Subunit: 150 residues, 5 copies
Amino acid sequence: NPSDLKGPELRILIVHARGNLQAIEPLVKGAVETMIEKHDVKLENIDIESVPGSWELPQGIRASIARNTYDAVIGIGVLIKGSTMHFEYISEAVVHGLMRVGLDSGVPVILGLLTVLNEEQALYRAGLNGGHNHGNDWGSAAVEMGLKAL
Amino acid sequence: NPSDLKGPELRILIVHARGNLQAIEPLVKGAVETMIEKHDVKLENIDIESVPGSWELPQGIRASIARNTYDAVIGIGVLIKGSTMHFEYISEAVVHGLMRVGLDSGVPVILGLLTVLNEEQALYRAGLNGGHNHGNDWGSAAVEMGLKALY
Amino acid sequence: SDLKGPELRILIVHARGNLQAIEPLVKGAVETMIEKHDVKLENIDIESVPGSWELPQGIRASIARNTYDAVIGIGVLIKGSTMHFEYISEAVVHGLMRVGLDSGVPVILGLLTVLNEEQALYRAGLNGGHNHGNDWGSAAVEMGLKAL
Amino acid sequence: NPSDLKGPELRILIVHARGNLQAIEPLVKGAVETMIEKHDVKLENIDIESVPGSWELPQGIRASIARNTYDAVIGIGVLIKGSTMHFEYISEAVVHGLMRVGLDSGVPVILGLLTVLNEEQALYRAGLNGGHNHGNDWGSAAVEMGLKAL
Amino acid sequence: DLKGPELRILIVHARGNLQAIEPLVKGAVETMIEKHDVKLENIDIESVPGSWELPQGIRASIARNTYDAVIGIGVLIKGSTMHFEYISEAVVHGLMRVGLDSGVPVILGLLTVLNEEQALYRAGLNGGHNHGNDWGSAAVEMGLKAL
């Protein structure tokens, strides 16, 4: 178990979907602020890209890490169960896709996908309403894996 | 600003299944119209191919992107839960197959697969009966991913 | 419907579990291809494997030996008392998709994943049902053709 | 469809887990006896190996078919639903793993995995208490796939 | 009576739910040393933040060093969302894939439980059996059969 991980030279990629921006924004912010403030990652070394939806996360990431070199990637998206089976099938495919991209590439990919039953749960996990911002955890994870990959 | 994304040079492939044409037609139309009118995609640059069912979607796409060059693909199909477990297993394999074809090829594949409980849900998601045509969203996603693929 | 594939070579691999349902499905696929799409009887290879589990491998092995424009994998899985049905249904469906994608040869899913035998027979065209094998035959012809 | 399949020259590999040996033993026995007595496979041409649990089946098989040449493989294991979600996740992963090893290697891999709700169901499928020994079916399947792979 | 004095074993564990993780890792190690004669110097232990990182942590490590076997240990507890279901499935598949891709035996040491009690129980507490011991023996056995 580590303690004070600093990655001043780590290059971090954050790709986030744009559905449910109320939850996405705090998550990205929390990941960024945690990496900068707690791990000395440099703001200019954090590329933040977006894709329309969670479905595009794996491909978005795959495309970006083929272009630039990153020490770790955080894919962030929020899927909320709806009236059809859409949520179940794409949640599964996206999580599998994210794992696959990480394993195929050798680049640590941190899962920042919330797969919740309703918006309240998503907001709660983004740090609102007394909840804990999971983005912070993902930021620290990215830093740790990025460092271990070096 | 998704609306300000223009892809006059994008070559987009739309492969759609032919099951549940009442829902498929508006979805395909929505995607095409959105790409053309909202993203300046050229009608000549949009190839539309069909396959019998959703099952054939990954293979139809895989075959087509091996033949021509596309900046993005939209796989469209409507799967409605039936009396057997057919729906559950093929929905899962098709979604995985679409994701796989995209990742294997590097070509953005937009999921335009409706996995619904009944036809009303499908029609509703095709923009009928007060619903929003999801095909429009897929058209915009394809343009955005196509552009981000080149640049 | 006006799709003709007089030069298509089609492979049908079917499992042998639940032959009462398998036979009509295979027959419907073959008849539909011959009668409706002008596929030649001698250009249709039919092979069988013991169960649905072997469908992906039986197909992979066959398309590695001969050249086919399309393949129909036919099997009938009926939900039983254990979780066997769920796990192999998913693995076989995945396997069939994989073999198609890996090989580039269209693989038509002719796998029924039903709750009971009545549903399987119904989908094989018995008891007022529609023979799904016919649809698969047409799908195979269409995909074989589109694979140019 | 086939009549009387004989594989006197077939080399068959059986890899079996060791969890729930009461059920495993009859399965292996049924497969072996069926291949020998009904398909003329030679006892000395049947290699039997074991791994600790079902999780290790794909890897155990992969390792063995890399070392020796087999016409077919039967992977045998018994997973019984427990109190956690372990059963669901490993059943899926092992079944997928077995299909993968077979497709990857081109060597027929017969699924000899029981995924049951309780031990009674497992013994029943191992031919006890009036049940049919599924191992017999697997032995015949292996011979048939082994022969067709020629 | 399986002894692997020359086996090099890697244990990668997540750090979520350390109350359960610690006994698991300890059990796997003690078992390998005491029961299989694996040498303390030949056991590498690395950690990753969460179960999600297990496959990648393992893949990266077996690319760097040579191990005869690997145990990926993590504890996932069902929560209020569907997170548990989706990641358990992806991590288990991830672990199976890393082992098959690399040819290095990967022993699954992931607990996928409904609550903490079940995890602690499978870590040898409150009268339970420490599953880490079993993983330690499986790793040894697979490490050896890989030779």
